[PDB]
Amino acid sequence: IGRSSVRPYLEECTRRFQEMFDRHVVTRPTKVELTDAELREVIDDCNAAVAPLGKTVSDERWISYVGLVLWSQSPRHIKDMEAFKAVCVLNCVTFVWDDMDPALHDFGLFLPQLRKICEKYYGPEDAEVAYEAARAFVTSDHMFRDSPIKAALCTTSPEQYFRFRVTDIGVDFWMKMSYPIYRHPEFTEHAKTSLAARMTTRGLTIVNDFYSYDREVSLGQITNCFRLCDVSDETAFKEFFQARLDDMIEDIECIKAFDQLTQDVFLDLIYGNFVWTTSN
Amino acid sequence: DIGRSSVRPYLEECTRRFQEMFDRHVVTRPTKVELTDAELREVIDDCNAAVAPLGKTVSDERWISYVGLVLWSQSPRHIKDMEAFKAVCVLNCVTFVWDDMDPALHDFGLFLPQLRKICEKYYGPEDAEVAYEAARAFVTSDHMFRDSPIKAALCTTSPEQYFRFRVTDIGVDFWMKMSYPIYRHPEFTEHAKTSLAARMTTRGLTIVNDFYSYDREVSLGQITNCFRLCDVSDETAFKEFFQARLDDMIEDIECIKAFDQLTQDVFLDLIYGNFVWTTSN
Numbered sequence: 001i002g003r004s005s006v007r008p009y010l011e012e013c014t015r016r017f018q019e020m021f022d023r024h025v026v027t028r029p030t031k032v033e034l035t036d037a038e039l040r041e042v043i044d045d046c047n048a049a050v051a052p053l054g055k056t057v058s059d060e061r062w063i064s065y066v067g068l069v070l071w072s073q074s075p076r077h078i079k080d081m082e083a084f085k086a087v088c089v090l091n092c093v094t095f096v097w098d099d100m101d102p103a104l105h106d107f108g109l110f111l112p113q114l115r116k117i118c119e120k121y122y123g124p125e126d127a128e129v130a131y132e133a134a135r136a137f138v139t140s141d142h143m144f145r146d147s148p149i150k151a152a153l154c155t156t157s158p159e160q161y162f163r164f165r166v167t168d169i170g171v172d173f174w175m176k177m178s179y180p181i182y183r184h185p186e187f188t189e190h191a192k193t194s195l196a197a198r199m200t201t202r203g204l205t206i207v208n209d210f211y212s213y214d215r216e217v218s219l220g221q222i223t224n225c226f227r228l229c230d231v232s233d234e235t236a237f238k239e240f241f242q243a244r245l246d247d248m249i250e251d252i253e254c255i256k257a258f259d260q261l262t263q264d265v266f267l268d269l270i271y272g273n274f275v276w277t278t279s280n
Numbered sequence: 281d282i283g284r285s286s287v288r289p290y291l292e293e294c295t296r297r298f299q300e301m302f303d304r305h306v307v308t309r310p311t312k313v314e315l316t317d318a319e320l321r322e323v324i325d326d327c328n329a330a331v332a333p334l335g336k337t338v339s340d341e342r343w344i345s346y347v348g349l350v351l352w353s354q355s356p357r358h359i360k361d362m363e364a365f366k367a368v369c370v371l372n373c374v375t376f377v378w379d380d381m382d383p384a385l386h387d388f389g390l391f392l393p394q395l396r397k398i399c400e401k402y403y404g405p406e407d408a409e410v411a412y413e414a415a416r417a418f419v420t421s422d423h424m425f426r427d428s429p430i431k432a433a434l435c436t437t438s439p440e441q442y443f444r445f446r447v448t449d450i451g452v453d454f455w456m457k458m459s460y461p462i463y464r465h466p467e468f469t470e471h472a473k474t475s476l477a478a479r480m481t482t483r484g485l486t487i488v489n490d491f492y493s494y495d496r497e498v499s500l501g502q503i504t505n506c507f508r509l510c511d512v513s514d515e516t517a518f519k520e521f522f523q524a525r526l527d528d529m530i531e532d533i534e535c536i537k538a539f540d541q542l543t544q545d546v547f548l549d550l551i552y553g554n555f556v557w558t559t560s561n
């Protein structure tokens with residue numbers, strides 16, 4: 001699996017993902033607009049949060065990361081741009097954290113910076129919800145490095161793998177820091193029960209996994225669902241890829257039973273993630 | 281008509297096969313946490329206080345029957361905090377009583393402050409907020425999904441969509457988020473807080489609960505039961521579906537054995553203890 005690649009399938013799978021979204025989601029992703037002042041505030045807060053780790057990060061790097069939030073959130077339904085900036089900052093600094101050598105992970109310096117971001121942008125209750133989700137996420141990543149649990153869950157079956165990824169891909173965290181953006185009671189409850197995360201995990205993870213496969217297997221990373229099939233066998237791969245598209249479609253069609261605003265947000269997230277993933 | 285279907289022809293054989301599966305795959309027999317008379321009386325007093333604003337009188341016998349689920353399903357070897365344990369006893373019991381009420385009588389303005397009072401009595405400041413939020417989210421979910429098209433979609437589409445809904449709906453995320461203070465075990469605490477603990481144990485709990493509640497639930501039009509996804513009046517179709525559900529339980533148990541020893545003891549004691557309590561009452 002160390003020298004395997006999905007490169008033969010890259011164009012066809014991209015085309016098929018886009019065809020699926022065009023058929024099943026229809027509504028095209030749009031990019032949330034930040035003013036120059038708002039982007040500056042976001043970048044200032046990102047830099048302050050990773051400064052204690054000695055990180056200098058370029059504006060260009062921060063802006064590439066924040067594009068995920070601008071594309072994946074749902075601009076029609078935004079009601080709180082302070083929460084929106086918080087998600088921009090939290091997303092960005094977690095990306096930088098996840099790219100660092102783990103041996104330099106100083107939780108004592110980083111967790112208080114996450115808390116500071118949450119207390120700046122959210123009300124008291126929401127700040128605790130967002131902070132706990134951020135804490136749980138980065139703590140999980142640390143716990144499962146070389147854990148037998150990760151090996152068991154990621155190699156047993158797609159169901160066990162996606163069960164691990166509800167947390168490990170970050171979508172529970174994303175939902176629990178994003179609901180204040182929308183101030184929509186139903187969405188808030190689905191975020192807090194993690195049903196929102198459970199409904200969107202496969203569509204986010206399958207896309208992310210396909211486009212990270214070559215890099216991740218080159219680094220010995222096992223958290224990728226395409227490791228569960230023999231990608232070098234075109235027949236096995238196409239069968240597995242179709243099964244994953246079927247998973248995404250079943251989730252999308254189930255999401256359409258949610259209330260209109262919630263379904264818009266869930267579907268914008270899955271489709272926006274795909275656009276951002278393929279653009280950068 | 282599914283409203284008249286029954287799993288009664290399969291009751292004995294399925295009970296035997298569940299027990300055979302647990303004997304082979306979990307091995308360690310459930311044991312009952314012991315409560316002193318004083319501790320049991322404190323639990324019952326707090327249960328009665330919590331539901332008194334609703335005008336509910338409940339008998340000691342009824343509370344003790346509910347308490348038994350916690351005494352059987354928790355893991356006595358690993359207990360470190362019996363205050364947390366009493367909290368789970370009280371929260372389990374009052375939630376059972378709430379769920380058995382006519383929903384027309386659900387006064388959240390009266391009930392939620394009583395849950396908060398319980399949490400603040402028995403837990404530290406941080407844990408009290410975690411347990412209360414999970415209790416709040418659970419009872420709020422029940423309210424918002426009554427007659428919801430989301431419930432219909434998730435519960436009729438596939439077993440995977442159904443179990444995704446039941447991670448919350450059957451209460452196991454709530455259970456884990458009020459139970460981790462019992463054990464003060466850092467790994468378990470994190471699995472409870474990420475809800476991986478709930479996701480690992482949902483199928484084993486739900487399949488057992490669904491099997492023994494089927495006749496009751498279908499007679500009331502309740503759709504939250506995985507055996508509605510098969511034709512239980514066709515023996516061949518039922519046996520195939522039941523085996524598939526047993527396979528799900530086994531795959532989860534075998535995966536749970538990859539967790540650290542204390543965590544896996546707690547997870548497996550929960551699934552197997554739930555089955556013992558379910559069949560005894």
Ligand code: NA
Pocket residue numbers: 029030031032070071072073074075268272
């Ligand atoms: Na968008």
Ligand code: NA
Pocket residue numbers: 310311312313351352353354355356549553
């Ligand atoms: Na037990």
